[PDB]
């Protein structure tokens with residue numbers, strides 16, 4: 113039962129632009145619900161259409177639940193000059209930016225944990241019949257360095273009870289993250305999300321390299337058909353790279369399931385230095401909420417698509 117809570121414009125203070133791009137415009141603000149002195153840091157999204165963003169709200173409200181650690185939750189919507197979505201501010205931004213900016217303190221334990229968490233979030237969505245269709249490092253957000261959530265439901269589709277696939281029309285889509293069958297046939301499944309997951313893992317393990325850098329999107333299907341894939345990141349031992357390679361198998365049903373990826377990456381996270389080789393790993397640290405001074409980090413922080 114999908115509900116949308118309408119939040120009054122007057123309940124938001126200190127609204128400031130955070131960034132714009134393919135996803136629209138995102139602002140940060142403080143939400144003060146009437147009848148509370150609680151001030152909640154929020155992110156606020158609008159497109160650049162009203163209908164498009166309501167489709168995203170619908171999907172997000174549909175998949176929310178009491179226990180939902182790794183998928184962004186819609187707090188509500190605001191009707192202003194635009195229709196806006198409201199969510200909890202993720203103060204450390206997106207994981208693509210995070211891994212580029214904190215490379216020198218990202219250890220093996222963080223990378224593997226992020227892999228587990230994304231897989232848990234995707235398994236959660238699969239259980240709710242949701243095909244995300246846009247999983248990428250740019251669309252994973254960082255609540256704390258130890259805790260990430262999947263975002264951007266702009267392309268996501270709910271499968272009917274009898275449906276195993278979504279067939280798309282001619283909209284703009286992220287070719288370099290897509291399964292071969294999605295490029296050729298516009299077919300999307302849970303197993304095509306698994307392909308995108310493998311690309312997402314590659315982005316993390318390269319500390320935010322661009323996939324197939326300097327290769328035109330029009331050439332990707334031919335590269336994949338020839339058996340070529342993204343290269344082995346230097347930190348990755350063979351077992352980690354083989355997971356990625358299994359995610360990029362031609363046969364969709366041969367690819368790992370999210371349930372299996374949770375288990376495998378959890379196993380690796382139990383012995384992280386066995387699976388990723390990072391110079392100075394043991395000497396690295398990132399802010400954690402168990403730190404006395406974590407609040408410092410928070411204040412400091414809080415303060416792709418082509419036509420097929």
Ligand SMILES: */C(=C\C(=O)N1CCC[C@]1(C)C#Cc1cnccc1-c1[nH]c2c(c1Nc1cccc(Cl)c1OC)C(=O)NCC2)CN(C)C
Pocket residue numbers: 130131132133135138154155156157184185186197198199200201202203205206207208209250251253263264265
């Ligand atoms: C990713 C960086 C990035 O997203 N940044 C850099 C500074 C601002 C910005 C845009 C942000 C943010 C942010 C912060 N907190 C929560 C969410 C988001 C957000 N960012 C993106 C999406 C986000 N999700 C939002 C935002 C508001 C409201 C809702 Cl309901 C919601 O969930 C859908 C998103 O939807 N798509 C991607 C960006 C690297 N660049 C993306 C390249």
Ligand SMILES: [Cl-]
Pocket residue numbers: 225226228229
């Ligand atoms: Cl974890």
Ligand SMILES: [Cl-]
Pocket residue numbers: 135168264265266267
């Ligand atoms: Cl979107």
Ligand SMILES: [Cl-]
Pocket residue numbers: 360361362363
């Ligand atoms: Cl194959």
Ligand SMILES: [Cl-]
Pocket residue numbers: 285286287288289329416417418
């Ligand atoms: Cl692309």
